[PDB]
Symmetry: C3
Subunit: 31 residues, 3 copies
């Protein structure tokens, strides 16, 4: 379970980091 | 405690997957 | 270690919520 939890939260931060980059670009392109 | 963490972890991951979907749609819509 | 995982999960959720608000604003202004 601990591995399971560490892996899922890592995955979460990695995808969150990536979406922040995408949102930052859309924001610039937009208004 | 560990169980309530898993709960938050799985919830965060689900919302991240949804956001990915929202962002793919926005990137296409905005171009 | 449990506390580091809890910090990470909370940061993960904070970012997620924040991205939901950013996406929500983009969608309202996009159209
Ligand atoms: Zn992407
Ligand atoms: Zn949505
Ligand atoms: Zn922001």
């Amino acid at each position: 379970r601990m591995k399971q939890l560490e892996d899922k939260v890592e995955e979460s931060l990695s995808k969150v980091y990536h979406l922040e980059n995408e949102v930052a670009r859309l924001k610039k392109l937009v208004g």
